[PDB]
Amino acid sequence: TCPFYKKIPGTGFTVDAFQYGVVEGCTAYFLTHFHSDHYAGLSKHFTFPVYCSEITGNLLKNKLHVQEQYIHPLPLDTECIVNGVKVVLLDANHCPGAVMILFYLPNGTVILHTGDFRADPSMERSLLADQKVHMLYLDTTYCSPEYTFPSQQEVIRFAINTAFEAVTLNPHALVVCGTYSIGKEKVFLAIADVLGSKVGMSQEKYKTLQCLNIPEINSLITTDMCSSLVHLLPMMQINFKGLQSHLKKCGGKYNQILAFRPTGWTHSNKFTRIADVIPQTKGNISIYGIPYSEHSSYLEMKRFVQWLKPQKIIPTVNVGTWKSRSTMEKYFREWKLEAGY
Numbered sequence: 223t224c225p226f227y228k229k230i231p232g233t234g235f236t237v238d239a240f241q242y243g244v245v246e247g248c249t250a251y252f253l254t255h256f257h258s259d260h261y262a263g264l265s266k267h268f269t270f271p272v273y274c275s276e277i278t279g280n281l282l283k284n285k286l287h288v289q290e291q292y293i294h295p296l297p298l299d300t301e302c303i304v305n306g307v308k309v310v311l312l313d314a315n316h317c318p319g320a321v322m323i324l325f326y327l328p329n330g331t332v333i334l335h336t337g338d339f340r341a342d343p344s345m346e347r348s349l350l351a352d353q354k355v356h357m358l359y360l361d362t363t364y365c366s367p368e369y370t371f372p373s374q375q376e377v378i379r380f381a382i383n384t385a386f387e388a389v390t391l392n393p394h395a396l397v398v399c400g401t402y403s404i405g406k407e408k409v410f411l412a413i414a415d416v417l418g419s420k421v422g423m424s425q426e427k428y429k430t431l432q433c434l435n436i437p438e439i440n441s442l443i444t445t446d447m448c449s450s451l452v453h454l455l456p457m458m459q460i461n462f463k464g465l466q467s468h469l470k471k472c473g474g475k476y477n478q479i480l481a482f483r484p485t486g487w488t489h490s491n492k493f494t495r496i497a498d499v500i501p502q503t504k505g506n507i508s509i510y511g512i513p514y515s516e517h518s519s520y521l522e523m524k525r526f527v528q529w530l531k532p533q534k535i536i537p538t539v540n541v542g543t544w545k546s547r548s549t550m551e552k553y554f555r556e557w558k559l560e561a562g563y
């Protein structure tokens with residue numbers, strides 16, 4: 223059965239609720255972004271209206287084969303009316319096509335659902351400026367102060383400098399980047415740009431990137447692996463075994479691999495700064511783990527919520543344990559007492 227935190231009260235609406243069959247009373251199903259935990263249960267044979275961004279709609283149509291008659295794409299930063307209720311989609315600063323949703327209830331209640339987001343001070347000058355919000359449905363992935371990590375800009379700088387140094391020392395090195403979903407495209411695009419190369423990949427991954435409305439994308443990516451010295455592979459292949467196997471298929475064009483594994487937060491972030499990071503190495507193969515997060519850090523989350531001053535917060539992540547729920551509730555109270563709302 224559909225849990226309470228996926229339902230919007232006073233409406234016929236659900237958010238990211240496709241894995242419970244037909245939800246009784248649901249007139250419109252919203253999808254915040256094309257990540258598998260959120261779209262789980264959507265397939266070719268789904269027959270109810272789906273509301274989403276244009277990019278999410280392209281992926282539904284082309285990758286999951288949902289019929290076009292059930293896909294309702296909406297523009298960003300624009301007042302739209304769905305089943306007689308005013309809604310606005312906002313960029314979530316997550317993966318391509320990811321949105322937050324504002325619902326203006328007939329009775330005057332205002333609800334913000336963040337989907338998955340990486341909070342940023344630029345959101346304080348969106349359409350949210352001076353907007354009363356009664357309920358906030360919040361991406362609480364990293365709601366604890368131990369969760370620290372650098373800016374995306376800092377992480378990209380490290381990656382670009384590392385790749386450029388390695389290939390300048392050895393022009394016959396190949397660069398490989400792991401992927402298992404959309405998001406984090408800046409990692410491989412920034413590296414390929416500094417190296418003067420297109421990014422090479424499978425037909426399936428090419429299809430996925432062609433749905434994302436990235437400007438000038440045809441100039442940046444290719445299925446011709448032989449023409450490229452930055453390759454994408456599944457994240458599961460980024461290990462010494464999988465990279466040794468990949469190198470053997472490249473026809474003696476390369477004699478070294480430098481590989482990147484984009485992660486979220488990991489335990490090493492407690493101890494070792496991005497500037498000090500080193501790779502794991504075996505022979506002519508090196509692997510860097512880089513913490514490129516598309517979720518709020520604890521401090522980013524805290525600033526956004528203290529600025530917004532919501533009357534009630536409903537977490538949407540880490541909801542399944544009493545320990546997690548208690549910890550989150552204690553921080554929300556702390557934040558409220560500190561800021562005076």
Ligand SMILES: Nc1ccccc1Nc1nc2ccccc2[nH]1
Binds near residue numbers: 393478
């Ligand atoms: N590329 C080359 C060709 C002829 C003679 C020397 C070099 N320099 C070099 N530096 C490396 C650093 C790591 C791996 C391979 C490397 N090759």
Ligand code: NI
Binds near residue numbers: 255257316338
């Ligand atoms: Ni996500």
